[PDB]
């Protein structure tokens, strides 16, 4: 086991996308993903008047079982395989690390969320590091946390919490359209507040980026398009936006808690090259009362221990460099666990058992089809 | 344990839309005709001198119904053979022995089905497509068409009274009767039973986006004299507009008429309006270019929903661009099926097996005469 002191200090572009459909199946064709799997922002000021009910339709929420909603490296590799075959001249993508934005967000946000655990699996294959959350650990963590909530909250509060979760998806539904306005039917526009809401559908952008000298492929869910998707398909990232919801702010204490969320939102968007985020603010009856659009670049200054985004990024840089330094890049006989333990506040890198390596390399992280592809090159 | 889709099939989103592009001006390059005896006429002088009608216009549109000379519908399917016969003659005699300079060769009616699709989601489409001599040839499928009309007819017997079934046949006759009573066989100065054998077919060069296309289409009459397209006119009939429901019925027809005329560069359309007793009560002249605004300004309604001609055209542009992108132009070893399935609302492109390819290339679509000609160039 190796240990990285917490005191350690060191232009994104989308290259492909994929989606999960309403039935939980994955969609890989680039054209169809762009044509019918990403929505467009539409929320006129006239409707931010307190009439929009973000808990309406809760009972028919189509919710994916959490066991099928963990970060999945397999679909990422399936999409990557297609990209390499069809758009990278049959060559492997030129990065050092392949992972999900949400996992990197956990690393970036760590210095100011020392109460949150982190557990990541890392393994070297074909000269690249593949990083994902651990299925077993994650599933158990989610189960434990929900069971704890059910047990420690009144029935009313627990149901209220579930409705808050729902309201985020509901906000996305009532603040977006499936196509540009000019290509929508009147029914598609006028009847969005009644449309069934689901969390099966996801649009996943995969970007090439990096930090310091590290090159990274990062996959992340994107909520919508702010204006349009460039016809020539260039610099599409700058056209995306995130959509969040939170409670109205009625006191100083609530504002400080909002800054903590803002930090996490900055981390998510910054890593992904997303330049805009809209927050919807709702009351305890779930009515939409205010909306605010933030530029990602200004969030650090809207935030006023003491959160420092620069320090966070220097820490993140140090973690990434450390992994690249400490994990033998061409040794495929081992797998590693990167862990942050909140009870001792230690950030650790350890070698997993051979059988854990076997599990990861033969299904959980790497797929047979991806390995066969990379072998064939 | 069954694939979600065939590995030999690709899907186009119904939401796909091309950017609006410059209007293309169609131009006639040759014509051919089918005579009263059902024989084809290819000589340009003879076709123009003997096979063209001229507009000239109580009147009972079901009169003479008893003698309607109706060609057997299985002898009236769109025929690539006659088109290729006419095209060969054109290439030999007027194009300096070179192939016509287009990407796609097909019939107007088939393209109309694609253009009108967004507002006709219950109507199936099935087209055969194949690459030959650097060009795509597109026709309906003979067997599918045969089965489909019979299927629909059985469905009618099964759902209609003998009288209403009879009423539907008289409605069909009334259109041909209107043409007969509203035209002369020659210009007035030379004029000293109803049938659907006689057809005058204009073949035009046109385009959409970057695609160049040859389209063959029946033309009803000349409005003044033989830029020949600008001298043609379409003739249609429909029931008088005595209720909102009839306005609904008319709008669907008027949109299809716009699509047909727009694609062919026909600039004028006359509708005859008839009552229950099939008396002609009103006649209205339209310019094709004014139809989209008439439809837009109609409060009554029916991308599904309100018909929008611009949206239709953007869909059509997307379809044509997609076909040209997805079907290898220089591979003559394969044939394709383009299909819209109303039950699933999916638009797909599927590679046919070798024996279907052979059937199309060796008689049904390509003729031996046409292939020998193109080879000799």
Numbering used by the authors:
A (entry chain B): 2 to 11, 18 to 311, 322 to 394
B (entry chain A): -6 to 50, 58 to 192, 203 to 236, 242 to 317, 320 to 394
Reproduce the article's own wording on this structure.
We have found substantial variations in the activity profiles of the Rai1 homologs, and discovered that some of them possess a new 5′ triphosphonucleotide hydrolase (TPH) activity. Each structure contains two mixed β-sheets that are surrounded by α-helices.
The αC helix is absent in AgRai1 but contains more than four turns in CaRai1 and SsRai1, which also have a longer αD helix. Therefore, AgRai1, CgRai1 and SsRai1 have a distinct 5′ triphosphonucleotide hydrolase (TPH) activity and do not have PPH activity. At the same time, there are substantial differences in the positions of the helices, the connecting loops and even some of the β-strands among some of the structures, and these differences are especially pronounced for the β4-αA loop, αC and αD helices and the connecting loop, which form one wall of the active site pocket.
